[PDB]
Amino acid sequence: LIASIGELLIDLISVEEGDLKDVRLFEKHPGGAPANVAVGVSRLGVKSSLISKVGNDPFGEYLIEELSKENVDTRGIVKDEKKHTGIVFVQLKGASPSFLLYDDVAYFNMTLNDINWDIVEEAKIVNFGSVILARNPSRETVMKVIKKIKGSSLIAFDVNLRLDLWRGQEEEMIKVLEESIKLADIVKASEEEVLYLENQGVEVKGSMLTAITLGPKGFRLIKNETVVDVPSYNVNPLDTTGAGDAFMAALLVGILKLKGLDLLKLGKFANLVAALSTQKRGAWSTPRKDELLKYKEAREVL
Amino acid sequence: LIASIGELLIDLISVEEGDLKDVRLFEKHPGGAPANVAVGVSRLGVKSSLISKVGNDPFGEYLIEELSKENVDTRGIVKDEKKHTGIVFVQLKGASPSFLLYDDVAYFNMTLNDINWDIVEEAKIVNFGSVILARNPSRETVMKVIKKIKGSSLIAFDVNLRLDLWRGQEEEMIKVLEESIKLADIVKASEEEVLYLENQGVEVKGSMLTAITLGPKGFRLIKNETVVDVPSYNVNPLDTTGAGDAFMAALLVGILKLKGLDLLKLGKFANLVAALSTQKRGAWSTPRKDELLKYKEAREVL
Ligand SMILES: Nc1ncnc2c1ncn2[C@@H]1O[C@H](COP(=O)(O)OP(=O)(O)OP(=O)(O)O)[C@@H](O)[C@H]1O
Numbered sequence: 001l002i003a004s005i006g007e008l009l010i011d012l013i014s015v016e017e018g019d020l021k022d023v024r025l026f027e028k029h030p031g032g033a034p035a036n037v038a039v040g041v042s043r044l045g046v047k048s049s050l051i052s053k054v055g056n057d058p059f060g061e062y063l064i065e066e067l068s069k070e071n072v073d074t075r076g077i078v079k080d081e082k083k084h085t086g087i088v089f090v091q092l093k094g095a096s097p098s099f100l101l102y103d104d105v106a107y108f109n110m111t112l113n114d115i116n117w118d119i120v121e122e123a124k125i126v127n128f129g130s131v132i133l134a135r136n137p138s139r140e141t142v143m144k145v146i147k148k149i150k151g152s153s154l155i156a157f158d159v160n161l162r163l164d165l166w167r168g169q170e171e172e173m174i175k176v177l178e179e180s181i182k183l184a185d186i187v188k189a190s191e192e193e194v195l196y197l198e199n200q201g202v203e204v205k206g207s208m209l210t211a212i213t214l215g216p217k218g219f220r221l222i223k224n225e226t227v228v229d230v231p232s233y234n235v236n237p238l239d240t241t242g243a244g245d246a247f248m249a250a251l252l253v254g255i256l257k258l259k260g261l262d263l264l265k266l267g268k269f270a271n272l273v274a275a276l277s278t279q280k281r282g283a284w285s286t287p288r289k290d291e292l293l294k295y296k297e298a299r300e301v302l
Numbered sequence: 303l304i305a306s307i308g309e310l311l312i313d314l315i316s317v318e319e320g321d322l323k324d325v326r327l328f329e330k331h332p333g334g335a336p337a338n339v340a341v342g343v344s345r346l347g348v349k350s351s352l353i354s355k356v357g358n359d360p361f362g363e364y365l366i367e368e369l370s371k372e373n374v375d376t377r378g379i380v381k382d383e384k385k386h387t388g389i390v391f392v393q394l395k396g397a398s399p400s401f402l403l404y405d406d407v408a409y410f411n412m413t414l415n416d417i418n419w420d421i422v423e424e425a426k427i428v429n430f431g432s433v434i435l436a437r438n439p440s441r442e443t444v445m446k447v448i449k450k451i452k453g454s455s456l457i458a459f460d461v462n463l464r465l466d467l468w469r470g471q472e473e474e475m476i477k478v479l480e481e482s483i484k485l486a487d488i489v490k491a492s493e494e495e496v497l498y499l500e501n502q503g504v505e506v507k508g509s510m511l512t513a514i515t516l517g518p519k520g521f522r523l524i525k526n527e528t529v530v531d532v533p534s535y536n537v538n539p540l541d542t543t544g545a546g547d548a549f550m551a552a553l554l555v556g557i558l559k560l561k562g563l564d565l566l567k568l569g570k571f572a573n574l575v576a577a578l579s580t581q582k583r584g585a586w587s588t589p590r591k592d593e594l595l596k597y598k599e600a601r602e603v604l
């Protein structure tokens with residue numbers, strides 16, 4: 001029903017605060033925006049699959065197992081015999097969070113052969129990554145997939161901009177992103193990204209819907225000429241790490257379930273799911289359907 | 303006086319038992335045989351340098367700093383503007399130790415332009431690993447360097463066989479190892495490595511001295527046809543992880559200090575350093591000079 005295609009990797013999360021240079025301990029967890037959204041969609045009660053590529057190693061097996069536990073279809077996840085599973089060391093704490101991502105990994109080495117078309121086509125909504133586009137052959141491969149299915153399925157794109165991933169090739173970045181946006185019916189981006197990109201002559205807009213996140217403050221929806229600000233519900237945030245992908249998961253589930261872009265319904269659903277997710281720890285903080293039924297906002301969609 | 307050239311990387315050590323797939327926590331430490339030996343040499347009171355390459359990232363800075371605290375000369379460690387610092391996830395525990403090494407990293411990307419010849423000009427002994435030979439351009443860069451210095455500095459080679467690093471290129475492995483051995487005045491290898499290579503038709507012996515390790519049973523020193531068996535000191539091992547590199551550091555310092563090749567003195571000094579290193583944890587377990595003066599076998603050499 002809903003399929004995601006993009007980076008699937010291991011997050012080595014710093015246990016203590018400090019620069020990556022000084023951090024002594026790391027805790028491993030499954031990561032990758034597309035995979036995080038795929039799990040969120042699954043927890044919302046919607047069948048979901050992930051098309052990605054991991055290495056034929058212990059980390060690869062771990063990721064497939066963890067996704068399997070969340071009920072995400074992994075049949076579309078290929079194992080690479082040359083490249084090892086993706087990894088990124090992260091420091092989520094402090095005033096200036098940082099990361100060290102290793103790019104010669106399996107998810108950046110996808111080829112058309114690696115794509116399971118039966119799955120990408122059965123889906124009503126196809127969500128693809130921005131990070132996955134920083135390196136070929138995955139870039140070419142993904143752009144080819146999105147262009148091919150366009151029109152047959154709704155396309156969703158989260159800008160999720162990472163400048164460090166395009167150093168020395170920013171021009172190409174502008175092209176790839178602009179091209180991606182133009183293919184997406186549903187586009188998600190933080191206000192910062194929106195600003196940074198328009199300042200490059202790039203319009204951050206989805207042909208069907210645009211969702212601009214405004215941090216803990218809230219989000220904003222744009223339908224044609226209609227602009228709606230949605231303040232965030234009150235919560236005593238435990239961890240907002242997964243808020244972005246939880247928000248995206250809810251947004252794609254809401255669109256799927258609600259015939260007619262009722263931004264009021266949709267807006268309330270995403271706000272609810274995103275806010276509540278700040279109660280869970282980690283990259284997969286999307287609340288389960290069984291927990292959202294108590295709310296009228298969710299009952300509408302779910 | 304003593305220079306090491308080879309791999310320098312971050313060891314992500316599993317804090318708990320289990321397959322890497324299930325390990326949750328990893329503790330980061332400096333690793334790499336040549337780096338480990340350089341530290342051991344420095345601790346024994348001899349000035350040592352390391353020629354290697356790390357990425358221009360937090361982990362690269364970490365490694366350079368840790369080596370500097372050990373007084374190892376780091377001028378010969380270059381920063382790669384593209385490739386990231388080497389990393390290896392390791393499970394040292396259990397009966398079946400395992401690891402996951404990422405190969406497209408800085409130390410495997412060394413070119414002749416990365417070689418600080420001055421540091422190489424000073425060295426009376428140059429130590430290099432076989433792991434660094436696993437990939438080009440570093441393999442050719444290292445082979446060329448050692449070939450040029452041959453006859454000006456004593457050459458030391460620790461076979462340190464890691465078959466997983468040569469899958470698909472085992473024939474080449476046999477050729478490079480043999481070339482490296484024939485280029486070395488000093489060769490170190492485990493009995494297991496000696497048998498594997500002899501069976502491959504390769505003779506494991508240095509032109510000046512050969513040290514065959516028998517693990518906890520001690521080692522064997524060989525010059526020409528004069529053999530000297532050195533049984534292990536009687537100790538209760540706490541951690542043998544760094545014993546090999548501690549042994550190599552002692553062997554080189556001994557050769558540098560002791561007038562002739564008195565195998566008895568050399569054997570006693572190396573044995574003492576190795577045994578005591580088993581009392582310290584981690585890859586850098588070589589005892590410091592200050593902790594050795596109270597030993598007769600050490601006073602001579604030191
Ligand atoms: N403390 C909070 N209380 C209520 N809702 C929140 C809170 N934090 C985040 N949210 C909701 O989740 C959405 C996610 O916001 P966040 O600041 O994580 O941006 P994002 O879209 O994840 O950006 P990025 O791509 O940089 O991670 C917000 O727009 C907001 O509505």
Ligand SMILES: Nc1ncnc2c1ncn2[C@@H]1O[C@H](COP(=O)(O)OP(=O)(O)OP(=O)(O)O)[C@@H](O)[C@H]1O
Pocket residue numbers: 462491492515516517518519520521534535536537539542545546547549573576577580
């Ligand atoms: N239990 C022990 N008691 C005393 N000495 C030991 C013990 N274990 C190792 N050693 C000393 O340290 C030296 C290092 O040998 P070790 O068995 O660690 O192999 P190695 O040369 O390090 O190879 P590898 O890379 O496979 O570890 C030995 O030759 C020995 O003298």
